[PDB]
Amino acid sequence: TLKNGGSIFEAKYNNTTALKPLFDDLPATAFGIVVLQDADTSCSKDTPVINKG
């Protein structure tokens, strides 16, 4: 959603049925991704492909 503006470092994420803070929950061996600019909806949760811009 943050492609349309907001605060990093306070982004939530969606475990089914709830919303919870991203950074605090992220496991020690994993990285998460937050779309800040994407004109053509190329990033999707199951396939984050980034293209020019």
Partner 1 sequence: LAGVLVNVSAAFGKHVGTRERVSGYLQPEFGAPAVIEFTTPAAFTSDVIELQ
Rule CB under 5 A: which residues touch Ca ion? 38, 40, 42, 51
Q: How near is the Cβ of 35 to Ca ion at its closest, in Å?
A: 9
Does residue 38 touch partner 1 according to CB under 8 A? no
Question: Within 5-34, which residues bind partner 1 (CB under 8 A)?
Answer: none
**SS3 sequence of the chain:** CHHHCCCCCCCEECCCCCCEEHHHHCCCCCCCCCCCCCCCCCEECCEECCCCC
- The one of partner 1, Ca ion, none whose footprint includes residue 7, by CB under 5 to 8 A per kind, is none
